[PDB]
Amino acid sequence: MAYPMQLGFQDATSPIMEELLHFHDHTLMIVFLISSLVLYIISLMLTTKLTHTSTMDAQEVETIWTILPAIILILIALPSLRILYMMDEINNPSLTVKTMGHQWYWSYEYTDYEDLSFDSYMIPTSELKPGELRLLEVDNRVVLPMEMTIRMLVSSEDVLHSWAVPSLGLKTDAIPGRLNQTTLMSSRPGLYYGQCSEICGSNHSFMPIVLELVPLKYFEKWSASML
Amino acid sequence: ASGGGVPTDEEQATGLEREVMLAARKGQDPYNILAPKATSGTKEDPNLVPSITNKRIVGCICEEDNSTVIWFWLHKGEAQRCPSCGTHYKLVPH
Amino acid sequence: MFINRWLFSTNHKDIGTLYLLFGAWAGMVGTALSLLIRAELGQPGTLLGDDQIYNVVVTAHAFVMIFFMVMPIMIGGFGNWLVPLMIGAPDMAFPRMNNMSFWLLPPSFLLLLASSMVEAGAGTGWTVYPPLAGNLAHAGASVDLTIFSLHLAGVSSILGAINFITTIINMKPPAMSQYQTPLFVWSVMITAVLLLLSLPVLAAGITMLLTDRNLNTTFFDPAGGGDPILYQHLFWFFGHPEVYILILPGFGMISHIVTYYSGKKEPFGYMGMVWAMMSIGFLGFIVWAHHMFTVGMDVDTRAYFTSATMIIAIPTGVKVFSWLATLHGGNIKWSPAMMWALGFIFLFTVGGLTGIVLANSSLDIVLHDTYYVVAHFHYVLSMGAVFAIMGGFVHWFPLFSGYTLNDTWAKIHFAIMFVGVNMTFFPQHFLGLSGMPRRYSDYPDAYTMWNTISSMGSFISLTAVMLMVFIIWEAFASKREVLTVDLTTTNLEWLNGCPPPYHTFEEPTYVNLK
Amino acid sequence: HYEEGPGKNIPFSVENKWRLLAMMTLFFGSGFAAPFFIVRHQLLKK
Amino acid sequence: ASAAKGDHGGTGARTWRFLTFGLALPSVALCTLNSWLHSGHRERPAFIPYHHLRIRTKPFSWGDGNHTFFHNPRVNPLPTGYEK
Amino acid sequence: KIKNYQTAPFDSRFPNQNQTRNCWQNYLDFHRCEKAMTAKGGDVSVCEWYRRVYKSLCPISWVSTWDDRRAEGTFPGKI
Amino acid sequence: FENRVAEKQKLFQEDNGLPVHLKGGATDNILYRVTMTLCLGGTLYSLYCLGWASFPHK
Amino acid sequence: ITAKPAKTPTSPKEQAIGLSVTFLSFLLPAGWVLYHLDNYKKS
Amino acid sequence: HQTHAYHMVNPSPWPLTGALSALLMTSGLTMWFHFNSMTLLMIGLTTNMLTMYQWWRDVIRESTFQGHHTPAVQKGLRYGMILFIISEVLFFTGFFWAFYHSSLAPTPELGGCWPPTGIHPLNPLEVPLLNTSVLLASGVSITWAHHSLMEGDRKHMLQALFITITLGVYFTLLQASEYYEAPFTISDGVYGSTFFVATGFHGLHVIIGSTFLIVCFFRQLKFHFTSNHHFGFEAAAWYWHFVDVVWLFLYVSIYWWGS
């Protein structure tokens, strides 16, 4: 989850999210460098009483400041697209889970074997147990096996929603009539939080997502008990 | 087939359209449709700038293909020079 | 006479003045809505109500700022005032149709205000996506009034685009080629081409939403074989060109301001600037699905849209470097308009660069529908389009009015606004990277510090807006009349005096061919 | 014809700066006030 | 293509009148014959209350709310089937 | 033939993020197979793979609506 | 039909200071008044309708 | 630019009045609405 | 007095009455869709027609009767009309995109096929082919009208323009009959939606274009056009060819390929 005064991304919980962190570090360095260069050059242009107001020939220097940005863009696009196609690669999941968005909560279906499904609603602020997080906890968490490739399928039974979990690098829109797929793999046990990420009406801010990542044998027994 | 009955512009153009038409036929351009062609622009052979008043704005494209046009009021009297290239212009009021 | 002049106008200057007044009033509305947003978010918990009232405010904020403040001021206001003067033309090509472009806007605005007064308002986002905006989740008249508001604004701008393109192509001095017209005129021509091509597609999409809502069509409804995502394509096919429409006249005014207060007779690299604006205009039509990287599109389509979007940095970079090269060697005049333009160059660059971050579809999965997007577009809109509007307003106010502003007050105003907008939006990058979603009325507790700071920033910007009104009042109250303006040889719009006569260029300029 | 010159090419009078202050106050104030009163209207509906 | 016709020399009123009466209106006449010749009602198919057809998410703003604007009782079933 | 089914495998026909048609096709295939069998006398057991795949992939409400429409005679796919 | 454009040209070029939308004669003023009355009255009526629609009606 | 001295100079006191009136025209009506928000919500 | 060739237009009320008619039509549609009343809408349609009539009347006064359409002014009007047609093309492009989006990827609700289960399309070789021949023929006859006008031939201009209008009317009547006879409706899912909204806006443009041709017919009867100056006729002909080309795209896309 996010923590107070956080500046950057939530710590990565999945290898893909780790890849995104390093790619963001690379891109932000370039962003910093170019912004700072432009600010510096502005100050340089403005700090001399020397003048030169006659016509200036442009041809030579426009080569520099076309070719240099083109090279920089290529230096961004290459790692960007590598991660894109990595995130797309075939992986062979062990488990498929569906989630359906609704106004205003998520339901989950685990129907590889038995017909397991339940609804997952925000815990009202007045009912939080001590130490629980305002607007983030749910009554029924999305229990999942850690260290395993999971296929998430996402849809909606009413308006648009979007199913997100920032620390896993996931955001898949929930569209009625459409079954969108993403894959999820947590390197660690724990609790990982997300929030509805497409405006969906009166309680858009109040339909969060909580994944609970545990060893397979715990997930199996939990699954059985949820039937 | 064939036959007539459609008026011509000669017959039926009126107002400013007709003035422009009749002037063009005489080779004249009172409504500034054409670009004037430059003289050599010396003080001896200044560009001659018609006006219906005693001043008119000139735009000077000093060199072929300059994208910057140099604009100034030209007043009745002694020829004036473009402030960028010095080419001469003289107002001819009428 | 008053009605003939101000309701029946066929005069490009008076119609420009009408647009500037309309846009200034809209700007107050838009500012009030922005303060309601930030009041709701300025402490954790709920201030106004749930997300419906909150997102009616957000939705109206955006529509007002875009369609009633920026476009009327830049295109209807500076465009009508300056384009005919900068080409020596005696008015617009269609001076009477021009007046209808203006008068469609108060009705368009009335329809938007009606949408927020009836039922529970249109709490849809300015993108108006179905099915939230459809007749089950937004039953009643509010969304239809919003659609009709957009229809009228769209007709206004399409007819205005026809007027500007025709005027700029057809009414220059016969010796003046397109490569002898000023960059602001180019910027308006290209913006008008974008308006002409993109707004009809928006009109098509929102008409389909209207019939899905009222005539039982199902363009966007899966039950009939429709698709919500089709709406998104049609909307963003307009909506990406629209953001270039919002900035291009700003680029044009920045070129004139930087050139003027550098003491230069011309911008650096004129044909490069023309090339860059045309390139940006063209590339702005082939990138729209970067608004759709999380909807489930195939990976090769995501790779194409990532790459095509990033290319626009190259022509845009040529413009930024050319503005810097215009400053180079200048006799710099530190006027208030120059300060707006310098702040523009830097802060626009920052927002353009976070836009390049977002163009990466892999990273956009995590940034999409978060405040990192909000930060990107307010750097280019609140510190780009708005800074160009303020710079142009302070630079050309003496031309339009015949009176001078107090330059010390105008610099104070710039200083306050600069602090305010940066305090508002810079922390929103942190909120975005750390996962705060868009269109939320309240947030998990961890996000409190940057939301508090951001809201405090928005109040500083409010103080700047109030001070702007006083500064305009003080100028009209004191009546310091303009005498001499420098550099008229390369700023033709000043050469008829301040204010110019009702009719200018009754006798056209003399320009020979040589 | 129409009046020309500073203070005459506008639809509002600048002949008295205090009347002008009132007019500008009503003009910009009404635009800034409107969203607050629409919010109130929506709150007092339900 | 050059189509298969032939003239020019001058494209003029006479040529376009020739095309109007010699090609365009004869083609309209032929298609009019073809059409008013294949008219004659088709059998209306069995009514099936498919959920993607006869959509009603809001009543129409005319009539009883349930009839389309150019409703033809012979061939346009209502959501509950053919009327009367 | 033997089981050990865990979940639906990658299917090269549906390699992209939109999996709507994968659910639909396997639903059709199951019910087509099942109709074929219950006729000629044979065993719906041969249809089982399609049944497992569509149950894995398809939202419960989609299956339920499609089942209701088949019973109603309003299912628009060909079975 | 005979060509009466010349007499229309005389009428609409008469030096009488009238704007083109009124220069045909009294019929222009009547049609103008009808149009503007419908527009302004209809606009007031639309504002009444907004007033009506802005509030809940049992 | 050069300009004439003000035709109708606006003294510092006059500017203080114009600035005060301008700020109050924005702040009072919104302040009234926000002060009475609870009144609105409760109702 | 001016010494350029452009037109300074007298101050005019029609921009304002046009803008207000737009307010009345849109608020009128809202009232019709949500408050069961046609009143505002009928006022808006009436003031809209009044505005268009008086505005274009004044343009005729300014040109035929006052002589303000110099060649430079006409050239601007040519660009204006071309740009207007371009915006109309892009408007139709949105509906063609909707049609191809839905028909190339038919969803499960349709049966996963195009045309959808339960849709029985019109035969494109019957009335739709007839309407194609009708608009193509009208494109030939309007070209004859244009050449007759340029050659100074009043009678054959009028004959050809009358034939063009008659064909426009024939198309509209055929299309109205086919709308009544069609066994599917606008509420028949995305097939009906795309079919009727796209051909419906096309039919509206045929009516607009026919009205514009009729205006030209009566102006021609009153001798307004000269053999060299007749931009209103040229504009109506360009608009008419645009309506014909949109029909050809609809016929190939929706009636034929989409059947």
Ligand code: HEA
């Ligand atoms: C004035 C308005 C404006 C402008 C000009 C832009 C310009 C750009 N925008 Fe922006 N954008 C918006 C307004 C604008 N945007 C809005 C409103 C939204 C949100 C819509 C909504 O959902 O409501 C948005 C959303 C948006 C998204 C969607 C993100 C999401 O929703 O998840 C993306 C993604 O690619 C994007 C990218 C860019 C890019 C690459 C540019 C480029 O044009 C920027 C190019 C400029 C530079 C790069 C800086 C100058 C260049 C140099 C100094 C050269 C060297 C630089 C490099 C080598 C990189 N924008």
Ligand code: HEA
């Ligand atoms: C031009 C566009 C523009 C501008 C200028 C602004 C300016 C501001 N915006 Fe907004 N905003 C949007 C367009 C804009 N915004 C859009 C498109 C959205 C997305 C909507 C959606 O999600 O659907 C958005 C969303 C948005 C949000 C996110 C809401 C959410 O996700 O829940 C927030 C929150 O802080 C915000 C705040 C502000 C603030 C505090 C300002 C302030 O900086 C404003 C300060 C005041 C000014 C800048 C004055 C403006 C007036 C003039 C310039 C008149 C000048 C007068 C003369 C020239 C005479 N905006």
Ligand SMILES: CCCCC/C=C\C/C=C\C/C=C\C/C=C\CCCC(=O)O[C@H](COC(=O)CCCCCCCCCCCCCCCCC)COP(=O)(O)OCCN
């Ligand atoms: C040649 C013969 C036909 C000619 C054209 C006839 C009508 C054209 C009218 C306008 C067309 C514009 C689109 C309106 C949308 C739908 C009309 C589609 C064409 C049509 O007429 O569709 C009819 C339905 O009309 C209906 O719903 C309701 C029809 C009336 C309601 C119109 C609602 C207003 C539409 C809003 C317009 C917004 C425009 C914005 C433009 C902005 C541009 C910048 C089909 O009838 P049916 O009974 O369903 O099926 C036949 C069964 N036997």
Ligand SMILES: CCCCCC/C=C\CCCCCCCCCC(=O)O[C@H](COC(=O)CCCCCCCCCCCCCCC)COP(=O)(O)OC[C@@H](O)CO
């Ligand atoms: C949901 C319902 C929404 C309804 C919204 C409706 C809103 C608008 C109400 C429209 C009222 C229109 C009244 C007639 C306007 C005629 C304009 C015209 O004809 O303008 C002409 C120029 O535009 C030209 O040519 C070429 C351009 C002609 C455009 C004609 C009008 C188009 C109006 C609709 C545009 C829709 C765009 C659709 C495509 C997306 C002439 O220009 P003027 O400056 O007048 O004169 C110049 C003088 O020299 C002439 O002698």
Ligand SMILES: CCCCCCCCCCO[C@@H]1O[C@H](CO)[C@@H](O[C@H]2O[C@H](CO)[C@@H](O)[C@H](O)[C@H]2O)[C@H](O)[C@H]1O
């Ligand atoms: C986001 C934009 C708004 C920014 C913040 C505005 C700053 C507010 C300025 C003051 O506004 C006033 O505040 C008073 C309180 O100080 C209110 O008086 C209220 O409270 C008083 C004191 O309790 C009573 O005397 C009054 O009757 C009662 O109306 C008064 O109505 C309101 O106009």
Ligand SMILES: C[C@H](CCC(=O)O)[C@H]1CC[C@H]2[C@@H]3[C@H](O)C[C@@H]4C[C@H](O)CC[C@]4(C)[C@H]3C[C@H](O)[C@]12C
């Ligand atoms: C040829 C054309 C106009 C030159 C003129 O007639 O004045 C110029 C103007 C801007 C130029 C372009 C811009 O300077 C940007 C690019 C700069 C690179 O150095 C070459 C390609 C590049 C894309 C240039 C190609 C070409 O020289 C352009 C397109």
Ligand SMILES: C[C@H](CCC(=O)O)[C@H]1CC[C@H]2[C@@H]3[C@H](O)C[C@@H]4C[C@H](O)CC[C@]4(C)[C@H]3C[C@H](O)[C@]12C
């Ligand atoms: C996004 C749009 C489909 C819109 C729709 O669903 O209605 C589609 C239609 C044609 C597509 C393009 C064409 O298929 C051509 C290219 C194919 C490449 O594999 C991706 C880029 C590529 C340039 C495509 C991008 C995108 O998928 C496009 C533009």
Ligand code: CUA
């Ligand atoms: Cu569900 Cu937002």
Ligand SMILES: [O-][O-]
């Ligand atoms: O839109 O960027």
Ligand SMILES: [Cu+2]
């Ligand atoms: Cu974009």
Ligand SMILES: [Mg+2]
């Ligand atoms: Mg989203």
Ligand code: NA
């Ligand atoms: Na809050």
Ligand code: NA
């Ligand atoms: Na011709």
Ligand SMILES: [Zn+2]
């Ligand atoms: Zn020179």
